[PDB]
């Protein structure tokens, strides 16, 4: 008889292998939660499309947006989704996630990926380079980014510094395939956000 | 024939999930070790314990110590177990471990939780929240949240600012329960050390 | 029909546990990729070798460098190694690796081991510990610890504070034998390096 | 190549061991089918729920009923149900049926139960007894006992003597919980009978 | 290692389980032994034969004996067959049976049956009556109905009242056929005979 | 997922064999639970020993009680060891059990039996018969019969007609052996009780 | 696919194991030829018969022939067997092979056995011995002891020193039985002889 | 259905492979059984022990005895072990036993063996010598030498020529090991005796 | 776990069964070492070959050599193979090996042999015998025989009288064809060989 047994670390969580197994020594390993999957709020802000036409043995700048602009873009686009912010809240991670499909049918690939954290907004990246020992991307096409590690305006968000909490990243896609492929990229940010809603109900003005 | 690989990230220890297996490719990827499993000494500050009654689809607050308190509990307790600290030492992370039991027999449900820790003392947490998205808290009904990024007293630790290595925690607890349920806390902190012993012994004095 | 998923955390890949086994639900937890057979460029740097002497029950400091020391070490090392270095490019990490052997044959013991990251310049480790809740060295024999969290000279490094990007370790080895054992140790640096190499060609000057 | 072979005991039947396995020596052996599955229907006369709490190691008393009453109430029910009996029939069995449930979501335990079913109506049962090994209720949670071994009005059926044909039951319930628990009962009578219809028509009158 | 034990519970002998299993927990259930194949001699009294015609779904009667004639019948053939009884025996049950088969080649149906114990020598049967719930027919094609619960002659058999040890039974048999079927029925009555002969030989008189 | 479900028939216990084997369609049929094991307490009166030779194809005589003196014996043994019976209770049945066992190391064979419930008073048995279609004894060498189907004394046992409650038994036991066998034979009466005990202590007196 | 080879060592053959094996690394070990199954003819001359009764603990003496006498016995009924031997053939060797059953059915006890070799003709062995590390018989209930390590009498075969040839053996037998057991016993002696037929016709006189 | 059989060759025992597999064709082969767990009692008698460093590729000489110090070492310890020896009894073999182990713990290597039996005392052996096709030692870390093939004093074990009866040897042990190793050699004779004792008391004097 | 253990009976090598068997109770049995695979050097001394039609149920004989011309060239081919014999050895054992094969390709039939030891020079062995109980040689189509139980001339050998350390072979082959067989057959000694070679080098005259 297993016992499962549970971990955080900074709000990344961990279950033990052998309980996650026996599901129908190993209990010794921790294997941790899918993101998407486990616990807090998912939250998908999408941000644009694009399509990139990659040659063989390259990779192509997804995104180059300045550190102002980044800022502007995520700050924009997530109270504009998110307010009015009613409950106490906090923001456990923003992924960058890429999501990547052919534009033509019948073509069998894998997807290859790379990015940069920092970097910073005094920089200018290459659009096209080599690939070099990148990431491969699983099945799902999709390649996720962890950019971790109260706001009325995006002025106010910037005088609180607030964009020190998370990288402006860079990142570039091809594949592995020895023809130029089309393909159609969506970028998005998903936040993780952990709700502290009380067990209170909400009435018409005025209560009791 | 499979090799056995190890690296250590932070504190983190992790193997090679192939050699993990073959006990009695999948090779290229690691597994992390149980923590208090793992290398370094457990050294279990027991805090308090608590019994709160859950209502269904909410879930309770633990603890809601200010800064000030959270270190002035943290430092007494370990300083007061510990003393003498006769060796170089490295506190390599700290747990707050919350435990849950039934305070009645012959109930069968799974134990819910979640924490922030960062927040700060000046917020006040609500008492009850509504269950969103939660950790799901496996069967050895313990919920073990990392808390890491020479002093005489409790002064000397605030004016060297080492309250700054390590968050101020405030936990969550429910159940996926359909009835009221009445629970007993116990709140711990389990700090991982690792033990710099010379080999050398204890003499009575005078030596030699 | 199971689809494979990837995420990066802080340079850390992870696939999902599902996707992983089936190559010949567990599918809703991730496994870390070997950094070594991970994404990024592999790069070691072997400092030096050495021959310690270890008593049972005992482990032997491995390397004592002052902090300029371990920083001007790596510094010469890394730049002598890698000078012009031609495109953009990022230290996804840096681990001190040791790499254990025995010295004699026919000898059948495993390999422990302890590390510190922090600690500072300005202290002086015991050459000699006791075994403490040590790691437990894989088949390999090697030691992994991750360091991590344009310079024309050292003076530069350490006028931009580069320094500050990674700790400075000190490693003993011992073993779990119970008899003395004579090991040669081999201290190397191995850099994870993200290339963004342009896709362009080099041509003689003048070009075109 | 097994053969299939069959046998009633006083209207309870049986099949081959042998031949109940092979579905997808043995064969010399015999398995009862389920009263409510085998032949003759099914009519279940619910009779009355109740609720009982009960605390650990003892057993509540379901039912109470004089003889005189036991028999008014099976004779009203089953006559008011049943009128018109068009066809010949015979009664092969009555089950007095306790059917338990928990008032309360998430209890874990098992129903214990204990009847008795001669007795006689000069006598008082107690209302609480102590568990002494009692009949462990299977997961359908529910206890099922045979009472076994032409009237227009009750008088007749009872000047007919043929309430000697069936017994008085009284059953106690409780359970295996270390706690008191709270049980709804649903208290019914069903009845195996065996009809005997014509192949003929039902005409308007006058026939033909 | 598992031990056999057995049970006799008037006349029907049962084994653990587990014991009939292992033969190449369990072992706390029993099953009964076949009648035919269990203690005691088998002693086949065939009455007659009886062509059937039966349509979809009805049930023909296959035998309307008066309790006079059943008991006549039984008495006679029985007597006719055993005289003389030379020992002291128990007749642990009578079985009537129904042995059915195809007139027809190439027929493939079940057969299905139902019974009646009491009854009573006033009352006629339906000679056709709608299949209701009825009992299935193994693929040995025999229905076997147990009627349980020192003569000269008939007469004397009455006068003991001997006949209330058993019923007089009635049968109908039909086919889970979508066409008219001609079965042909042979029916029998098969004694279970436990004789206590003595270990005594038998002499040419007169003995020594 | 199976569900157990359970039916009483005289006070035999059934259950699912469905549900009996999945405990590491069937579902349908029933196996009992064996009495001993099942419900209700086992109370086991050992009457007497008796040493019997028995020659190959025969069986001899265990006992040859006279009806008053099977009840005396019953009745006595039964009072003299329950005295007082202080709670409400029902015999459920009694059992007469014949355990065996050779007198000599040694020897493998089966035992064999055969018994007779009515039988009367005015009945002589024979000592030694042949072995006719016996009942096999298992490998715990035990032979159980069930005999089923508020006293000062054993004249009021008598004068209440309560001895009509049970039958009085006559019992066989050989061998399967080719040779003379030694066996050792205890008798035994075991009453499977349903104790109703209230809910109450007791008081020294006077109570309260 | 494994290949097949043979060794003779003093006529005792032997073939690879894993040859043995695969008939349906383990080759490099060889198995002994059962020498009755093995080649070269087998010769079974039955000695005598003889009724022991055993106490549990001990073995009885079998035979106690003096040297003259074992070797006139073997002698005699060899050449009295053989005669003529018409071709040139070599006794392999000579097993005294002692068969053993019980007297009485339905035993089950295992049989042990002891011999000595050598020993001489001027000793008396005891009629009865301890068991003492005997050696186990198998279910084939026989004990079988190599012996080994022209002449037209007895008095040749001695003057030319033949008996020299093989030993004069004592035998004692027993089992692992708790009571006396009655044992038959048969001795022979198996000659495993080798035969130098020529292909050559036998001819009625005078040939050609 | 398999049968066990057995044979004796020179006190060495055989059975048959196909009955020593079935235990939970290859019945015609047979198996040896172990001599120290087979018949005859085991004698142990321990002469020396002794401290050898064997250099790699090398065995080192154990034992150099004369023939005449063998013989006394090997008589003395014998008598003075056994003395009295109250029954018949006859040696079946000696064995020579080296038993080894290292004198450090944490080495891992196969010991390596070789004897010479004949040999004379008129002969000096090499103290070390080659390795040259030597016999592999088992994880028991023991080498067994057979040495086969009534006295007062060791004058008249030497003058009834005894001696002729076993070699005299001289055994050489290595390792397969890389490095030189140390180790700890045990010198034993285990005699295995057939003990005929008759089942006879001791009893004090005079006898009855 | 199991424990390998060894034993030698006169230069036959024996392991255990159950350790020979775990490679990838049966341990209680010893399994022999393929005498060419285990210990002890090999050395074949190829004799001569000879072509042999062999008709169906008949065997032809190999080699006839008188016994001085068996050890003529036994010791002449040894001699002449081994000079110098520069270290002190032992002969183990000789076989005398018969290799056989077809002279014609696509037959397929098996070997047969019989040899025998003694025999004597003074004797005349038949050119052709009748298969009888033969020996069945393997799929390698070698017959190997044991022979077993400092001369600077053959005179020395005879005049020490080595000859009577082993036997002179006769041997017959055959196959279990049914038409005549050509076979060409290859005759060698292989001598086992215990070498004990100094760890002393050879030096170049004079030494030191």
């Not at 900074?10 to 129908?24: E, F």
């Not at 998908?44 to 036409?53: G, P, S, V």
């Not at 504009?80 to 992924?95: A, L, T, W, Y």
């Not at 998005?188 to 909400?202: C, I, N, T």
Request: glycine fraction near 4%; proline fraction near 7%; hydrophobic fraction near 40%.
């Amino acid at each position: 008889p297993t016992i499962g047994r549970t971990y955080v670390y900074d709000n990344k969580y961990y279950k033990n292998l052998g309980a996650v197994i026996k599901n129908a020594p190993l209990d010794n390993y921790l294997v941790a939660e899918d993101p998407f999957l486990g616990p807090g709020k998912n939250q998908k802000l999408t941000l644009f499309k694009e399509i990139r036409n990659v040659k063989p043995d390259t990779m192509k700048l997804v995104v180059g947006w300045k550190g102002k602009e980044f800022y502007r873009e995520t700050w924009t686009r997530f109270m504009e989704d998110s307010f009015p912010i009613v409950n106490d809240q906090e923001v456990m991670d923003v992924f960058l996630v890429v999501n990547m499909r052919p534009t033509r049918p019948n073509r069998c690939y894998k997807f290859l990926a790379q990015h940069a954290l920092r970097c910073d907004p005094d920089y200018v990246p290459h659009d096209v380079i080599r690939i070099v020992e990148p990431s491969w991307v699983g099945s799902n096409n999709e390649y996720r980014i962890s950019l971790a590690k109260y706001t009325n305006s995006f002025e106010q968000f910037i005088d609180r510094v607030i964009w020190e909490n998370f990288y402006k990243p860079i990142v570039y896609i091809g594949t592995d395939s020895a023809e130029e492929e089309e393909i159609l990229l969506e970028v998005s940010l998903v936040f993780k956000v952990k709700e502290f809603a009380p067990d209170a109900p909400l009435f018409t003005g005025p209560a009791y």
